[PDB]
Amino acid sequence: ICKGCLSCSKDNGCLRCQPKLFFYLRREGMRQYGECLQSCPPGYYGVRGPDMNRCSRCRIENCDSCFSRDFCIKCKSGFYSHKGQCFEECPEGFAPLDDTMVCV
Amino acid sequence: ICKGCLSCSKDNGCLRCQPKLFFYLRREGMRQYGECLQSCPPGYYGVRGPDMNRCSRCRIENCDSCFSRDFCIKCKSGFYSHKGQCFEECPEGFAPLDDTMVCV
Amino acid sequence: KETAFVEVVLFESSPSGDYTTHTTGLTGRFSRAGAMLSAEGEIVQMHPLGLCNNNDEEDLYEYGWVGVVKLEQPELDPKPCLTVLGKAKRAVQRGATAVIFDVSENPEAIDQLNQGSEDPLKRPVVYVKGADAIKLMNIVNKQKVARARIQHL
Amino acid sequence: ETAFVEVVLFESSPSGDYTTHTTGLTGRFSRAGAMLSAEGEIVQMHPLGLCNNNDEEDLYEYGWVGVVKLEQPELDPKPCLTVLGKAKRAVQRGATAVIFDVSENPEAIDQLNQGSEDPLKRPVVYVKGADAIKLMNIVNKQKVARARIQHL
């Protein structure tokens, strides 16, 4: 059924979430149903709101997944991840890790 | 921009071919127009027909260029040739001559 | 309110390339919030909170779609980001060739919709209820894809 | 029986707002198919690419609006199919409607109205003249467009 759910409907999935959790509009093909989630999935990050807690679009350059508005986790291929930001080559005073997409 | 072409229209390209050549439909966005070719490209094969010569889709599982509807010339990489079909393993009724990429 | 003949079209392909299709008809009405034009397109379910301005760059959908929106009992959201009109209008802005409101929970919307005659949108806005609503929603929850064809006769 | 065809260009923005160009034109609703309005993404077809002569052809997405430029019937002496045949095959193949350009083959309009005995579920339209030119132009130049045909 619908999980993590305060108010709920068979058609739209979750309508209101338990307070700690985040509202996520998921597409399974034709349907888009509310979910009430602990962690947002790859490509998203959680946001606490007075209206409700909500999972937002990870809008940041060359970054597959992020923790915040502007802190990245996994960068897209060929980008080196240092200090929460994605970089083309590793920055001056920094060096790419062996066998890694991570600087120092 | 209208070659190999006996009959040629601004809207449909080739309508008939010079009779050495194979007829083909190019799908370029919304458009479909005719080309007259010497070679049917990869994915297709030539069938000298009574009306015209045309390229048909090679839909033999695992074949690149078809010799005929039911016979393969070139298998995809690592695919073993037999009855002019392609295989990941040479089936019964044929000992796989490895070096040659065939069965016997 | 002219009557909206909504034909939901399920389809099969076959190995030979061809399609067979069969047809559930439902019935709704067109609002004055949108045209008395027929429409047809791929059906896409829009959650109610998923039509708002506030989202900056929402998800991208191929132009030419049909919104289907399941509205609830209005106290389930007392402070909506928009009116029914604002959502219908957003959808259309974002390519909906039409929108189908399932107002089953909230008959109130019918009224709200026809009060928006001042701006009547390019594209039609249909309201459906009752068993006709049920059918649509079950088509949505069960079927992989489907195609709506809204007719104004 | 008049066919009020709208041909619609669309491009998105980053916000997913759609700016649109819309061209109207006039055809007639042939009785070989239904008189009903219809909407779909345009797909041109070579009339020689519309023959039940291939047992397995490639799958198009259901719901398209076909456009077929007809050429002088001397250019194919003995066709793979009739005009009717070609239209029905577009519908069979997923076309939600079929738009014919009978400019170079206007007799077809008569061959088409032969089908008024056993009419197809979907619109089968004909255009010609300036209307056909306007249509073909868009097809030939643009990446995409969406046709809205109305029966009124």
Numbering used by the authors:
A (entry chain B), B (entry chain D): 39 to 142
C (entry chain A): 53 to 205
D (entry chain C): 54 to 205
Manuscript excerpt for this entry:
The crystal structures of the ZNRF3ecto–Rspo2Fu1–Fu2 and RNF43ecto–Rspo2Fu1–Fu2 complexes revealed a 1:1 interaction between Fu1 of the Rspo2Fu1–Fu2 and a single ZNRF3ecto or RNF43ecto chain. Neither the Rspo2Fu1–Fu2 nor the ZNRF3ecto dimer show major conformational changes on complex formation. The first, extensive, area of interaction involves hydrophobic interactions interspersed with hydrophilic (complementarily charged) patches contributed by the first two β-hairpins of the Rspo Fu1 and the region immediately carboxy-terminal to the β3 strand of ZNRF3ecto. The Met-finger at the tip of the second β-hairpin of Fu1 nestles into a pocket formed between the β3 strand and the αC–β7 loop of the ZNRF3ecto, which is lined with hydrophobic residues (I95, I191, V192, A198). The αC–β7 loop is a flexible region in the unliganded ZNRF3ecto crystal structures and moulds to interface the RspoFu1–Fu2 M68 in the complex. The acidic region of the β3–β4 loop (immediately adjacent to C104 of the disulphide bridge) becomes more ordered in the ligand-bound ZNRF3ecto structures, probably as a result of electrostatic interactions with a positively charged patch on Rspo Fu1. For all ZNRF3ecto–Rspo2Fu1–Fu2 complex structures we determined (from five different combinations of species and crystal forms), the dimer found in most of the unliganded ZNRF3ecto crystal structures reoccurs. The overall assembly thus comprises a 2:2 complex of ZNRF3ecto–Rspo2Fu1–Fu2. The 2:2 complex resembles a crab with the ZNRF3ecto dimer forming the body from which the two Rspo2Fu1–Fu2 ligands diverge, without interacting with each other, as the pincers. Notably, the β1–β2 hairpin shows less conformational variation in the liganded ZNRF3ecto dimer structures, always maintaining a tight embrace, consistent with the Rspo2Fu1–Fu2 interactions contributing an indirect stabilizing effect on the dimer via the β3–β4 loop.
Rspo (R-spondin, also roof plate-specific spondin) proteins are evolutionarily conserved from fish to humans and have well-documented roles in a broad range of developmental and physiological processes resulting from enhancement of canonical and non-canonical Wnt signalling. ZNRF3/RNF43 specifically targets these Wnt receptors for ubiquitination and turnover, hence reducing Wnt signalling responses. Direct extracellular interaction with Rspo proteins inhibits ZNRF3/RNF43 activity. Here we report a molecular level analysis of the ZNRF3/RNF43 ectodomain structure and its interactions with Rspo proteins.
